[PDB]
């Protein structure tokens, strides 16, 4: 018999299985440990080739979109020119000293820009710029002693110079104020929701009433 079972929806009706008459359509992961080792080996080789430059270029901090992730922070593509100008860096020169530049990202709030400006300022203070000619050092370029003392970041996210992404600090414990004691939170929230939700109907009803007056 069949009995009481879930109704199957296994979705395996195509020629996925390799056989005598079908090339199949499959993907296996038997090379996964080897590819992990190769990727790490390539990263170590890349670090050696670009030494002493950091393996990962500097990236800004951005706020994740959508109401589900707006509380989270992560690294973005690149620094906007507005952030770079505020930090005192020409964007074309910044790309030559290991700073990622994104001319697409807007800066719609001061807090969003300020955190990235501080990131650039911290990176600029820690930067050791090798002279093009160690005989005739120009302004901004590093001395010979700093050149020999240079080391390579190599961190996964390239954030040793500036630190991890910064989250807002948790609020400290406190007492309840008198307004919070007596104020009806639900009524305030419901009224605001109803203002938007019934905005169209309320406006039409008022307009119909005004037309009734005239």
């Amino acid at each position: 018999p069949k009995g009481n079972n879930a109704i199957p929806h296994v979705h395996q009706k195509k020629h996925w299985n390799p056989c005598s008459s079908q090339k199949g359509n499959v993907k296996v992961f038997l090379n996964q440990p080897a590819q992990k080792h190769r990727r790490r080996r390539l990263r170590l080789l890349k670090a050696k080739k670009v030494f002493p430059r950091p393996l990962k270029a500097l990236r800004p901090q951005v706020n994740c979109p959508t109401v589900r992730h707006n509380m989270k922070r992560r690294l973005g593509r690149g620094f906007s020119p507005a952030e770079l100008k505020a930090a005192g860096l020409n964007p074309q020169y910044a790309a030559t000293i290991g700073i990622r530049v994104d001319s697409r990202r807007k800066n719609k709030s001061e807090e969003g820009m300020n955190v990235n400006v501080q990131r650039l300022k911290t990176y600029m203070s820690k930067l050791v710029l090798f002279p093009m000619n160690h005989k005739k050092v120009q302004k901004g370029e590093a001395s010979e002693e700093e050149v020999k003392a240079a080391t390579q970041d190599r961190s996964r996210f390239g954030d040793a110079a500036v630190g991890a992404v910064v989250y807002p600090s948790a609020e400290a414990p406190r007492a309840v104020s008198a307004e919070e004691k007596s104020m009806c939170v639900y009524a305030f929230l419901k009224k605001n929701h109803s203002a938007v939700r019934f905005f169209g109907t309320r406006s039409s009803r008022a307009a119909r009433k005004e037309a009734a007056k005239e």
């Binding site: 069949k2 009995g3 009481n4 079972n5 109704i7 199957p8 959508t66 109401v67 589900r68 992730h69 509380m71 948790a170 609020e171 400290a172 414990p173 406190r174 007492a175 309840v176 104020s177 919070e180 004691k181 009806c184 939170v185 639900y186 009524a187 305030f188 929230l189 419901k190």
Partner: protein
Amino acid sequence: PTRFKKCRHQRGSTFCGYGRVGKHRKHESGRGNAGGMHHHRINFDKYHPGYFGKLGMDHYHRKKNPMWKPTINLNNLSRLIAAEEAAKAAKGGTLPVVDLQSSGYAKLLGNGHIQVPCIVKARYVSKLADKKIRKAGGAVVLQA
């Protein structure tokens, strides 16, 4: 493992538990969910009522991120408060502050008796939850 299967037990049984009369044929009932309204109707109706038909409005291009709204009740608020803060929390004094959206919750529901009073930062709150938390000595502060 293969050695634990009925096939090992059935070596020498000829019919392997499928019978001499009926036999083990290829597809005696049809393939998959065939005959849901014909010759399998009783199985579908008694075990999966509601399977056939249409119901309700359509929502093209559903995006679950806008609809994100997990809930937590008042009686579960101790899960988001550290033990040391809960011990020092007393009605009418300094209370721990719970940030629901950073904890992964969007609405405070309010089932049961709240154990430790606290200040709760929530996007939404039910009216019963807001009433009970204020009576218990806590508060709810709206957040976004």
